[PDB]
Every structure is written in structure tokens, then in C-alpha cells.
Design a binder for this molecule. Sequence first.
Ligand SMILES: COc1ccc(-c2cnn3c(N)c(-c4ccccc4)c(NC4CCN(C)CC4)nc23)cc1OC
Ligand SMILES: [Cl-]
Ligand SMILES: [Cl-]
Length: 283
Amino acid sequence: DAFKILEDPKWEFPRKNLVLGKTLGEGEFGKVVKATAFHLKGRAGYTTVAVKMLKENASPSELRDLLSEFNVLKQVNHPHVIKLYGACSQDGPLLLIVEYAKYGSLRGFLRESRRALTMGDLISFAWQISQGMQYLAEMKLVHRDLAARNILVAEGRKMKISDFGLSRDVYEEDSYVKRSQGRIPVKWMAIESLFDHIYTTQSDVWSFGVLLWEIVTLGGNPYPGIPPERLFNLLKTGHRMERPDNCSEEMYRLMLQCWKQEPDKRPVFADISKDLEKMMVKR
Ligand SMILES: COc1ccc(-c2cnn3c(N)c(-c4ccccc4)c(NC4CCN(C)CC4)nc23)cc1OC
Ligand SMILES: [Cl-]
Ligand SMILES: [Cl-]
């Protein structure tokens, strides 16, 4: 029975210690509300947090993605990865108590700033995300849904990689796994994911390339008006997005390297973090 949730004493939090507040956002993803949690992870007072829960019209696959995000979050801990604090899994709706990111998504944050942001700010955002990705790749995780919509902006404009429900291990550990087919946005999928359903740390690098383009265009829309079929044929014949305005030559070069046809010819996240750090310190 996939509806039965086994309690994890390490993450269980009392429902009566949690004050549910205003809705931050609701969509296909579920429902996220702002909350105050009392006596969280041993501390004496209260903590402002975000709580994710199923929507009223949630389906079994939405519960499966919420449980999957919960189990991935239990394993990771990094300053540029959204932090799990606990959960209320018994005697009521499943609630995930997570780090609160006051600015919402990076896509909305960038779009709203069209708020003064410099190129330095943009490089620093990309660099923070690359450090998180680099740590996630050493944790043997393949994110699959890296995109500006799926990254949060917390206090002090700090990037927090989020949305771990579609995350996979680089080496599949289960004897039997039922894959939820075609869940990643077409425009953020690497060429090998589009043709062969292949998702590795190198396809996360291709998605990081699309994310770079989103950051540099302040939440722009990649490949405007190109249908999935034409997009796939264009990528197959070597066509890539042109250099957008307000993007340095060195930054566009890094994007092209992320979109190389051959996965092993793309840079690794450790190289990307050093590339972005040099770009930051040059100024
Ligand atoms: C202006 O609007 C917003 C303002 C603040 C937030 C906000 C603050 N903190 N926080 C979290 N901790 C999680 C989150 C992350 C992982 C697990 C559980 C919860 C979360 N989850 C979404 C991430 C984006 N994707 C796309 C869907 C889930 N959203 C927010 C969100 C907003 O808009 C939806
Ligand atoms: Cl701030
Ligand atoms: Cl997996």
C-alpha cells in the first residue's frame, strides 16, 4: 500500500507545535504555506518555516512525488540546497517543514527586477547554484528538473536548489522502479534525454546551461514559440540559442559548453564553480 507512510522518528514533528499561515503558492506541485514552528530541532523558541502539503484534489502520483521529495531531502544538507527541518506524517495530512525562502522562486525574483540587479549579482547567483549542484553530484544525485522556476531565493538573496520530487540516484538502487515518463520540461532537457530518456549529472549540466540563459535574461523564456518537434530537430542538427543581450562572451561560451552534443565533452560542476568564481573575482 503506497498510501501508508512509515514514521521516521528522526524527522517527526508535533502537529500542535506548528502554526499554519498564509499560502505562499499553490499549483500542480502541491500547496506551500508560511508557518511558525515551536521547539524545532531542539531550539528554545520558534522558527519561521514553509510547509508543503498535498492539494485537496491530490492524486496518488502527487503523494508519491511528495514522499520522494521528503526522502531525498532527508539525505542532503548544503547552504545552497533547501533544508528539511521535519515532517508531520502521522494522524493527518503529510506536512513537510522546510527552510523558508522569503523571495520565492528565482524566476519570479528575476522577473520582478526588470529591484536593481547587477551582472555581478547574476554571476553570484549562478555560482551559488553551481556549488549546490556540485555537492548534489558528489551525493550521487541527478536533479533532472534544474530551472529558475525550481530554485528559491532566501534571506540575503541566497540561492536554494529546491523541488527534489523528480530527483534520481546515478546508480538505481531498487530491484523494481516504476518510472513516471516525460515529466521534465522539454526546453530544459538535454539532447540524450529527449532521444534516449537518459538522465545523468551531465544532463543536469545541460539544464544548468538553460538556467544560465534564464539568469542572464532576468527570467526570460527559452526558445520562444518553438514546438517540441522542431526544438528536437534543431538540437539534433547542432542549433543552439544565440547570445542574448546583456551577456558576456565568456558567459555565453560556458552556456555553449553545457550544451555540447556529447555529454562527456561538457564541463563538470566542479569546473563550472571555478569558472564562475573567476568571473566574479575578475570584477
Ligand atoms: C511569491 O511566491 C512564493 C514565495 C515563497 C515560497 C517558498 C518559501 N519557501 N519555500 C519552500 N521552502 C518551498 C519548499 C521546498 C522544498 C520542499 C518543501 C517546500 C517552496 N516550494 C515550491 C518551490 C517552487 N516550486 C515550483 C514549487 C514548490 N516554496 C517556498 C514560494 C512561493 O511560490 C510557490
Ligand atoms: Cl535580505
Ligand atoms: Cl531513484
